[PDB]
Design a protein around this ligand. Structure first.
Ligand SMILES: *[C@@H]1O[C@H](CO[C@@H]2O[C@@H](C)[C@@H](O)[C@@H](O)[C@@H]2O)[C@@H](O[C@@H]2O[C@H](CO)[C@@H](O[C@@H]3O[C@H](CO[C@H]4O[C@H](CO)[C@@H](O)[C@H](O)[C@@H]4O[C@@H]4O[C@H](CO)[C@@H](O)[C@H](O)[C@H]4NC(C)=O)[C@@H](O)[C@H](O[C@H]4O[C@H](CO)[C@@H](O)[C@H](O)[C@@H]4O[C@@H]4O[C@H](CO)[C@@H](O)[C@H](O)[C@H]4NC(C)=O)[C@@H]3O)[C@H](O)[C@H]2NC(C)=O)[C@H](O)[C@H]1NC(C)=O
Ligand SMILES: *[C@@H]1O[C@H](CO)[C@@H](O[C@@H]2O[C@H](CO)[C@@H](O[C@@H]3O[C@H](CO)[C@@H](O)[C@H](O)[C@@H]3O)[C@H](O)[C@H]2NC(C)=O)[C@H](O)[C@H]1NC(C)=O
Ligand SMILES: [Cl-]
Ligand SMILES: [Cl-]
Ligand SMILES: [Zn+2]
Length: 587
């Protein structure tokens, strides 16, 4: 037992130096994609693997079930997982090269107008999807992004799957999805997620039908079938994963302009997020954060990984965000999400290295989103002068719940299906011959969406979603959206807020800060249900908090759709627009 403690000390001390090295290399590539920065990162990938290999093989000489201290037990179980360092060196080199090629391909992909400008995903294509109301322009960006990014990833993915599965098996799992699912250490995970998804089906179906009706009156009866799926390019988002950018088309009864005109900048957006955390009594970000973060897209023509991300450099002092920030409300919410990762990093920085993780990955994703729920309320937005004051009517409540639902509820089936697809790719039930076909089968089944153009040989639409080529698990985001409302509910009840949950603003609540702090400080030292119960008072994942938040909207949608005679669901997937009659005479 004294030997295991000696091992843990050596692991924590030595791991910090090598992980900090790798983080630095990984950052230098992410903020400057070049052949030199790529070469260095692959180099350091070898170095970190030799460390993982050294201490992982030692960790596997202990019998953890014979250890008394439960904290030391959890640590050694973690270190026994070699992850990709389990692969032989030649295969590891190939695997690391593949991950980098896929990540680079995605990040430098562009969609060009013939003899015109070339658009990048951020901000150009993102802005088209969010603001264009013309069927053909939206289709140009939607299909263009999948031709350039999606198709370009297909040649890598079969070998990526082969190798990530091999690493998992060498670490004792059945496949890579088994390894990923183990992050929640819950035997019943798949059933729990299925039941959570089913609890939210009534709400999503009613939202789907109402939004389908709104699109029907804007884009025309010839392009929207009221008993079928929605074309995937009309929801305001490249992946139809959140719908709030079409609030204008669906509101039942402009913040970007306000942020720009009033002088908001990327650094002021992250500062406002920082001020919100400190209003709760949580930690401010160090001066080194403002010094080293990349909070704007470079202007020197540098190629970078623009997708927002938060970084821990494993020295208790250096935490950074890398985001190509745009001055709008959407990205203000992203900034809060990213600042929640940083808060977590700082909260558990003094824990042993292997326990410096979220209670589960969903917890890490939820912290920032919890605060953003309060920032997004009309009261708080007005306090930020981004909205003129509103009266708290019934019609303004439904409008606000609708806005929130277009993001939170619409995201539920998308976040669910991403890893349903990957899990089945990893376990072998989906192969390269039907990657795209099963992707759209799930897009239909769970989201009720259809592709606006036929998918041809060589399409790989999963590859056009950042997390697929980047190999970042996605179920964490499904979990996050459920539990962030459980957290919101608990923090609001703690702060004394009474009444409708959607009117709660935990701004300045030191009680809410203390509750989040003690949970984040646990890191990964206790199974996540204990952290769940500390915050909420119960140990389970439950959709009830989310459903309580949206109860007024669910009631309103059910009535509205019933009186309009809507068919909930989409039984008619095989429909087309009518072909207008071509009458003569013919020149
Ligand atoms: C199994 O092993 C684990 C692990 O051991 C640890 O990890 C391994 C890998 C090795 O490295 C070990 O050497 C190492 O010790 C054992 O778990 C440990 O158990 C001890 C004993 O209970 C704990 O000590 C207590 O910690 C609490 C909490 O303090 C931490 O957290 C605070 C925030 O939550 C933070 O502010 C603190 O600075 C401190 O932070 C920790 O610091 C250590 C040292 O660097 C670090 O290793 C941890 O990672 C780090 N954790 C975090 C989250 O940052 C503390 O409250 C206790 O002191 C109180 O009580 C004393 C009397 O009992 C009293 O003298 C103190 O002044 C203090 O008193 C309280 O003070 C507050 C505020 O000042 C006041 O409001 C209260 O009124 C007052 N109360 C009283 C009564 O006066 C004490 O220090 C370890 O934290 C814990 N470590 C871990 C990682 O969990 C476990 O015991 C083993 N099990 C068995 C069966 O043997
Ligand atoms: C992004 O990465 C590229 C490539 O890694 C960086 O370009 C490199 O920048 C250094 C420093 O400017 C160049 O170093 C050399 O400086 C000496 C004098 O000090 C001079 O004699 C050399 O001829 C050269 O200028 C290096 O050559 C250069 N490499 C290339 C291929 O251009 C770049 O700095 C990075 N951008 C960042 C971090 O913003
Ligand atoms: Cl798609
Ligand atoms: Cl995950
Ligand atoms: Zn995140």
């Amino acid at each position: 037992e004294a030997e295991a403690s000696k091992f843990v000390e050596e692991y924590d001390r030595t791991s910090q130096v090598v992980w900090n090295e790798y983080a630095g290399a990984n950052w230098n590539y992410n903020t400057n994609i070049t052949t030199e920065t790529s070469k260095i990162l692959l180099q350091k990938n070898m170095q970190i693997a030799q460390h993982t290999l050294k201490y992982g093989t030692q960790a596997r000489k202990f019998d953890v079930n014979q250890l008394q201290n439960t904290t030391i037990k959890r640590i050694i179980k973690k270190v026994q997982d070699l992850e990709r360092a389990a692969l032989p060196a030649q295969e590891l080199e190939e695997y690391n090269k593949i991950l980098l090629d896929m990540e680079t391909t995605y990040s430098v992909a562009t969609v060009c107008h013939p003899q015109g400008s070339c658009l990048q995903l951020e901000p150009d294509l993102t802005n088209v999807m969010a603001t264009s109301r013309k069927y053909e322009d939206l289709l140009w960006a939607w299909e263009g992004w999948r031709d350039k990014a999606g198709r370009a990833i297909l040649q890598f993915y079969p070998k990526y799957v082969e190798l990530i599965n091999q690493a998992a098996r060498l670490n004792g799992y059945v496949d890579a999805g088994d390894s990923w699912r183990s992050m929640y250490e819950t035997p019943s995970l798949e059933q729990d997620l299925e039941r959570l998804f089913q609890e939210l089906q009534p709400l999503y179906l009613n939202l789907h039908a109402y939004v389908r009706r709104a699109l029907h009156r804007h884009y025309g009866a010839q392009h929207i079938n009221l008993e079928g799926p929605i074309p995937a390019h009309l929801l305001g988002n490249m992946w139809a994963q959140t719908w709030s950018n079409i609030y204008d088309l669906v509101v039942p009864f402009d913040t970007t302009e306000a942020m720009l005109k009033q002088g908001w900048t990327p650094r002021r957006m992250f500062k406002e997020a920082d001020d919100f955390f400190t209003s709760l009594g949580l930690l401010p970000v160090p001066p080194e954060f403002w010094q080293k973060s990349m909070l704007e897209k470079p202007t020197d023509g540098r190629e970078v990984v623009c997708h927002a991300s938060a970084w821990d450099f494993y020295n208790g002092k250096d935490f950074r965000i890398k985001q190509c920030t745009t001055v709008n409300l959407e990205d203000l919410v992203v900034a809060h999400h990213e600042m929640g990762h940083i808060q977590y990093f700082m909260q558990y920085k003094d824990l042993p290295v292997a326990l410096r993780e979220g209670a589960n990955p969903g917890f890490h994703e939820a912290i920032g989103d919890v605060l953003a729920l309060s920032v997004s309320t009309p009261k708080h937005l007005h306090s930020l002068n981004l909205l003129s004051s509103e009266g708290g009517s019934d019609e303004h409540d439904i409008n606000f719940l609708m806005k929130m639902a277009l993001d939170k509820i619409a995201f539920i089936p998308f976040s669910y299906l991403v890893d349903q697809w990957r899990w089945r790719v990893f376990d072998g039930s989906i192969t390269k011959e039907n990657y795209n076909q099963e992707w759209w089968s799930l897009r239909l089944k769970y989201q009720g969406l259809c592709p606006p153009v036929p998918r041809t040989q060589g399409d790989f639409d999963p590859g056009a979603k950042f997390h697929i080529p980047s190999s970042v698990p996605y179920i964490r985001y499904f979990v996050s959206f459920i539990i962030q409302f459980q957290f919101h509910e608990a923090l609001c009840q703690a702060a004394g807020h009474t009444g409708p949950l959607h009117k709660c603003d935990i701004y300045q609540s030191k009680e809410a800060g203390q509750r989040l702090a003690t949970a984040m400080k646990l890191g990964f030292s206790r199974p996540w249900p204990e952290a769940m119960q500390l915050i909420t008072g119960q140990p389970q994942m439950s959709a009830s908090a989310m459903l309580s938040y949206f109860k007024p909207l669910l009631d309103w949608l059910r009535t509205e759709n019933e009186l309009h005679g809507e068919k909930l669901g989409w039984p008619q997937y095989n429909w087309t627009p009518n072909s207008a009659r071509s009458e003569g005479p013919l020149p």
